[PDB]
Amino acid sequence: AKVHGSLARAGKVKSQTPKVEKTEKPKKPKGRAYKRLLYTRRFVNVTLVNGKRRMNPGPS
């Protein structure tokens, strides 16, 4: 109400998160080549259907 925000209490989970450096991958394609790439990912080499279909099978 009247001031009790207490700016010591602030974005503390921005302060105490351990930030590693972002990684480095090879360059993905773009333009039509990325839409070429996601074409085959659906109905050409569909990987793990686990009953009927699942797109990104998080490992379990």
């Binding site: 109400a1 001031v3 921005k14």
Partner: protein
């Protein structure tokens, strides 16, 4: 049929009847009476810039928690008094004291959303520094 007379030469008793029963709309009165700027502290437009007098902090209602850290701003053109709101993981230290600061409305035709009482606005940039570019800090802090 049911009232609403189906006479062929009977237009005015259906034309006075329409825009007599048009005043019941929740937004038609705010169209032509002009009420959008006899309160609601813009000129019926998007934004305005204010001045940071000081700040404050509110705790929400139940079931909610985690004090929301708004700021106290007087506005430039009418002298009206409504507060703002500062949505980020922090940046209340980034909005420092006694700066010009640009405002924006929450979307719901005023009407503070679900859990921040006494608020009407959010901030889009503070003295033209684009705090989006400073919260996710893809910017320096230019002079303020």
């Amino acid at each position: 049929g049911k009232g609403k007379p189906r006479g062929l030469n009977s237009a005015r008793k259906l034309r006075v009847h329409r825009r007599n029963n048009r005043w019941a709309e929740n937004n038609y009165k705010k169209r032509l009476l002009g009420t959008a700027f006899k309160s609601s502290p813009f000129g019926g437009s998007s934004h305005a810039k204010g001045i940071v007098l000081e700040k404050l902090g509110i705790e929400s209602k139940q079931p909610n928690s985690a004090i929301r850290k708004c700021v106290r701003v007087q506005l430039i053109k009418n002298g009206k008094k409504v507060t703002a709101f500062v949505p980020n993981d922090g940046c209340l230290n980034f909005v420092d004291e006694n700066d010009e600061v640009l405002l924006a409305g929450f979307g719901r035709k005023g009407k503070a959303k679900g859990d921040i009482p006494g608020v009407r606005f959010k901030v889009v940039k503070v003295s033209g520094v684009s705090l989006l570019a400073l919260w996710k800090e893809k910017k320096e802090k230019p002079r303020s």
